[PDB]
Amino acid sequence: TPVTPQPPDILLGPLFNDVQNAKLFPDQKTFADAVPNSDPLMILADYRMQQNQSGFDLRHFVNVNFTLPKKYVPPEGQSLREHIDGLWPVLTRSTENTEKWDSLLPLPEPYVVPGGRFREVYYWDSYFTMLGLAESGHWDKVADMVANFAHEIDTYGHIPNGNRSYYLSRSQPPFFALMVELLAQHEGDAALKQYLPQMQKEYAYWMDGVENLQAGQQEKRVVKLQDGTLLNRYWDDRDTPRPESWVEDIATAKSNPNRPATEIYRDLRSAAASGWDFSSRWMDNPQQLNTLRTTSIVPVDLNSLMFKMEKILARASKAAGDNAMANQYETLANARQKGIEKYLWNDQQGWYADYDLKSHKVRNQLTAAALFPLYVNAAAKDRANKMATATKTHLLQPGGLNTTSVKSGQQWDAPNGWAPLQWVATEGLQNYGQKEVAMDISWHFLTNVQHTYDREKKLVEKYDVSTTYPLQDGFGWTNGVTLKMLDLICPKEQPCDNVPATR
Amino acid sequence: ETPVTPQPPDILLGPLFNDVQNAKLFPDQKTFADAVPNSDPLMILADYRMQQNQSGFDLRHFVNVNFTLPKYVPPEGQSLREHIDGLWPVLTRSTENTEKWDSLLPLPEPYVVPGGRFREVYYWDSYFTMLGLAESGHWDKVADMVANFAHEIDTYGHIPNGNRSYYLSRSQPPFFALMVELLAQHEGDAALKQYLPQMQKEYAYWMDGVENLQAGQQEKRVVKLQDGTLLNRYWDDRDTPRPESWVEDIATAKSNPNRPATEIYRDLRSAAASGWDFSSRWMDNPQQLNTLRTTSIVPVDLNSLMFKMEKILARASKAAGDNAMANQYETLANARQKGIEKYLWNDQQGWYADYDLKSHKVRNQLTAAALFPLYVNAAAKDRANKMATATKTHLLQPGGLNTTSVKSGQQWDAPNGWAPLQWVATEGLQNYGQKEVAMDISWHFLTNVQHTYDREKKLVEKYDVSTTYPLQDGFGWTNGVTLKMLDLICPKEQPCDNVPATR
Numbered sequence A: 001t002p003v004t005p006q007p008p009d010i011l012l013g014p015l016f017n018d019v020q021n022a023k024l025f026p027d028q029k030t031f032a033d034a035v036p037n038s039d040p041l042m043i044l045a046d047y048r049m050q051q052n053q054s055g056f057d058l059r060h061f062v063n064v065n066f067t068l069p070k071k072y073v074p075p076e077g078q079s080l081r082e083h084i085d086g087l088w089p090v091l092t093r094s095t096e097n098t099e100k101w102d103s104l105l106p107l108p109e110p111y112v113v114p115g116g117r118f119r120e121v122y123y124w125d126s127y128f129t130m131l132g133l134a135e136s137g138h139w140d141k142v143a144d145m146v147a148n149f150a151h152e153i154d155t156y157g158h159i160p161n162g163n164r165s166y167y168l169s170r171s172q173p174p175f176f177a178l179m180v181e182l183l184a185q186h187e188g189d190a191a192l193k194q195y196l197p198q199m200q201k202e203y204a205y206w207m208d209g210v211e212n213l214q215a216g217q218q219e220k221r222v223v224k225l226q227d228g229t230l231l232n233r234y235w236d237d238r239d240t241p242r243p244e245s246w247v248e249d250i251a252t253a254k255s256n257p258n259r260p261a262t263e264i265y266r267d268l269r270s271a272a273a274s275g276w277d278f279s280s281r282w283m284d285n286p287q288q289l290n291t292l293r294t295t296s297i298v299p300v301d302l303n304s305l306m307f308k309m310e311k312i313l314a315r316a317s318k319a320a321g322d323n324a325m326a327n328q329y330e331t332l333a334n335a336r337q338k339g340i341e342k343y344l345w346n347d348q349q350g351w352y353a354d355y356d357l358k359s360h361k362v363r364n365q366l367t368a369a370a371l372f373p374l375y376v377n378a379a380a381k382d383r384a385n386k387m388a389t390a391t392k393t394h395l396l397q398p399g400g401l402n403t404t405s406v407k408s409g410q411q412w413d414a415p416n417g418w419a420p421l422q423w424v425a426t427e428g429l430q431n432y433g434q435k436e437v438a439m440d441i442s443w444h445f446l447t448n449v450q451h452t453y454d455r456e457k458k459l460v461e462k463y464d465v466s467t468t469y470p471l472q473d474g475f476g477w478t479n480g481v482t483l484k485m486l487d488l489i490c491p492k493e494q495p496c497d498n499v500p501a502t503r
Numbered sequence B: 001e002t003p004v005t006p007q008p009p010d011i012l013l014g015p016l017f018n019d020v021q022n023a024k025l026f027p028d029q030k031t032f033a034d035a036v037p038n039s040d041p042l043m044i045l046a047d048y049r050m051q052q053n054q055s056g057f058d059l060r061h062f063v064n065v066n067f068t069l070p071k072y073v074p075p076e077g078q079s080l081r082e083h084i085d086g087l088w089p090v091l092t093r094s095t096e097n098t099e100k101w102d103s104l105l106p107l108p109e110p111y112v113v114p115g116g117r118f119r120e121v122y123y124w125d126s127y128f129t130m131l132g133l134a135e136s137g138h139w140d141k142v143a144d145m146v147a148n149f150a151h152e153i154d155t156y157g158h159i160p161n162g163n164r165s166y167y168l169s170r171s172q173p174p175f176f177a178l179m180v181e182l183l184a185q186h187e188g189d190a191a192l193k194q195y196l197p198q199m200q201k202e203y204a205y206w207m208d209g210v211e212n213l214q215a216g217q218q219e220k221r222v223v224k225l226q227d228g229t230l231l232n233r234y235w236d237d238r239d240t241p242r243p244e245s246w247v248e249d250i251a252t253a254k255s256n257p258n259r260p261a262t263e264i265y266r267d268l269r270s271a272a273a274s275g276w277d278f279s280s281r282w283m284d285n286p287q288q289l290n291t292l293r294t295t296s297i298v299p300v301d302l303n304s305l306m307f308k309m310e311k312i313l314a315r316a317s318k319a320a321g322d323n324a325m326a327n328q329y330e331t332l333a334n335a336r337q338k339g340i341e342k343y344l345w346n347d348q349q350g351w352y353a354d355y356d357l358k359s360h361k362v363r364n365q366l367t368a369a370a371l372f373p374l375y376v377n378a379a380a381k382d383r384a385n386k387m388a389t390a391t392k393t394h395l396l397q398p399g400g401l402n403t404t405s406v407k408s409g410q411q412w413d414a415p416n417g418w419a420p421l422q423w424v425a426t427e428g429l430q431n432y433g434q435k436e437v438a439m440d441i442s443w444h445f446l447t448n449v450q451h452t453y454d455r456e457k458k459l460v461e462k463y464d465v466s467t468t469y470p471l472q473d474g475f476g477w478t479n480g481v482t483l484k485m486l487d488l489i490c491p492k493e494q495p496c497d498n499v500p501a502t503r
């Protein structure tokens, strides 16, 4: 019997809703990750029967019908570098077969997870994680992960936000082609050839529907502007509350009776697809999450990543010996680059930004997403220079690169600094010889990382850059980026294992 | 690892699907939607892209190589009844195993298909088909079919329009509960007890999201009116062209640049979910299919079936010995009946009708859907007597019951007569003692059916009632309804095998 993976709200019906609303567990993700002990359809029937009988106890019912999700001790005195290098096994999972009905989706090879409540692989986190794995010589683990993503492309049609049934309805910022280039650093062109069809199938997922799409319209993850410019947006195929944030999403939508709930759920999910759940970047009112409108906003990071995909597809086509095909992908990438420079650059403010599909204007706000055009080498040299200035002036802080300069109360905003954006900014700036700002981001963020390591003996998911669910530890992309920056800031011939206290 | 069910062909194959359909290599768009890929679609897409980048690429040859297309002499002298009874094995499929990428979905038990291009099981057709199977003693097949539908509810969460990957995003008019009751006629309460959990799970699919829906809003298949009244609508979870009608749907949306294509696609798919694809019933302008707005219309047929589902759920609960649960279901059914009498009855005109979410008013048009509240015994007697009058004056025709009185050019409109509606109308009228009208419909429709049989020796999907893709032959529901009607119109001790020439 083939399986058709269904998310927990669908599998369990209102029992899911009831358990989440009762908040039997302090994290909504906990019950999303419960494994039913038997056919969920029969559990549901048993539940209706038991509610209509005498002394029913929901907590007792759950305990007998579900299995729920289940402390690293390093040797003493490790440097920052040793600590990170020793954590890889702790963050590695091997889940080749899962119980029927489990929300965790099987994967053929071992994979590194972020840490803490994140007990599954994450699409964009993995790239940054794999950079650290590659840096420390764990190439089997890098190849394992590229294989896992290729397998998901093959089985599902795309790479899901992560390997959970409740993540299938969306993807995440697309780094798979970049992971294939990373593997190519170790295996050579062989990597490009090995994964060309999977890269092409991913691209087709992102571009699905494009060829029948009329100008001025959108569908799924594609937009076609009035002049025919083709760009992508983040989109989730569902319009209901996220199982893993069930009560929160319902509260968010209920707090705004001015919009149908379904529209708000779709925008929340699509912001989860963007990786930036959540951010003033998406909101009409920077202090009210319930005003977000992610699907009406064309993201400049996503589109930089799509240019990069198209450029890598050209390189892999060529390596496969398909020259005419490589030229087709170059032509595609050239158009993407024109689209970015016209529609994703704000000439009044002097920086890259998202495009607004409601107002048909470039948006005003500067965020760390504005560095992606540099990261992918799509940007004009003159605009890269302006981005260095914008960065120095508005985003660089003592503890690293600020996500935005808006303190909204949300995670993807001031004062939060996120490792992936530190690295994207650093690499972006270096691409255009802006070494000083690059180095400032790197030193500032590392100093922040080392400080928390000294005091707490750990690394965490994000950092407050104003000085150098609860906060989670581990932590995949922080670890990977820390290794890359460490190497960057000390000479190649005399590497440091902790951030030097004096620059 | 357990194999996953494939995506629909458009998603599976990428732009190759779109290309093959646009080229109209086959005269039926459904043909390529039913193509079996000979290897992994991921590799086929890559091969396609590569070969397009060469001289003399031939699309048709590429399809011939990479896909396999889908693949009766009765004894002489059969009466109409004997012909039908001999055809059951001809229309019966056994497909316990399918190739991993076939759009055909596996089923564990044999099943009767409608005929012709309908090479898969259909949700609502199957009920009328199973009535015929039951009448001619084929209870094994009835049980096979109920088991199949219970299995789909278990694996997918609902019964799809049919067992095809491109039907998974929608259901059909819900008859599963009535199929269980049919089987209960032979088995007794054993059937209700056995399938109670699957009936409950189908109900949860129809009502999914209801717990958190605010008054005045809709979501998926549920609507909640401003006074809190709960009703259902037809809904498809996708908003793209139907693979099996690809070019038609694209042309339809293209001809109305006043609406986003995705909304039109969602409304086309939702009409397919209603079984009435297509009809003036859903359309603002009857010569523009592109003006249909299915998802903004509360259907009186669907909501009658929902009432009947609730009634059957109470009856099954009682048979399983849970009296309090049974009373809960009775209460829901009572609420549904009030909803129907209030929002799905047009008192100005004196007939049942759909409710319009856009204008907040009961609609004016009389269609054969209006007999549904009689069929499920939801209607007040005085309203049933009015329906008999309405039926005589507007719908009854020499060749049977007209679907509507509007000759739009669409299939579910004058002058087309469809077997399921003949039977729904006949039984509903009989439920309220309106014997004369019910017999007229039966004699008139049967005479139509007999004459096509006399001339062409076949039964077909629909009939022109003004007198007694191309037209399909078989035909499951026509065969089922004809057996029930033949038994109805002749004395028990003088059964007929052909419709008598003189009533």
Ligand SMILES: OC[C@H]1[C@@H]2[C@@H](O)[C@H](O)[C@@H](CO)N2C[C@@H]1O[C@H]1O[C@H](CO)[C@@H](O)[C@H](O)[C@H]1O
Pocket (backbone or CB within 6 Å): A114, A118, A122, A124, A125, A161, A242, A244, A245, A272, A273, A275, A276, A277, A278, A411, A412, A461, A469
């Ligand atoms: O802002 C918190 C995000 C952040 C993502 O950017 C990372 O991909 C991920 C793990 O490091 N991460 C946690 C959170 O996203 C995940 O968790 C939420 C629920 O808390 C999911 O809804 C989201 O889809 C998932 O990526």
Ligand SMILES: OC[C@H]1[C@@H]2[C@@H](O)[C@H](O)[C@@H](CO)N2C[C@@H]1O[C@H]1O[C@H](CO)[C@@H](O)[C@H](O)[C@H]1O
Pocket (backbone or CB within 6 Å): B114, B118, B122, B124, B125, B161, B242, B244, B245, B272, B273, B275, B276, B277, B278, B411, B412, B461, B469
């Ligand atoms: O009027 C055409 C409908 C009619 C449905 O009411 C029946 O369920 C079905 C088979 O007898 N039937 C043919 C057609 O619907 C089917 O075919 C179309 C494409 O031609 C699909 O889009 C539709 O989903 C499917 O039910």
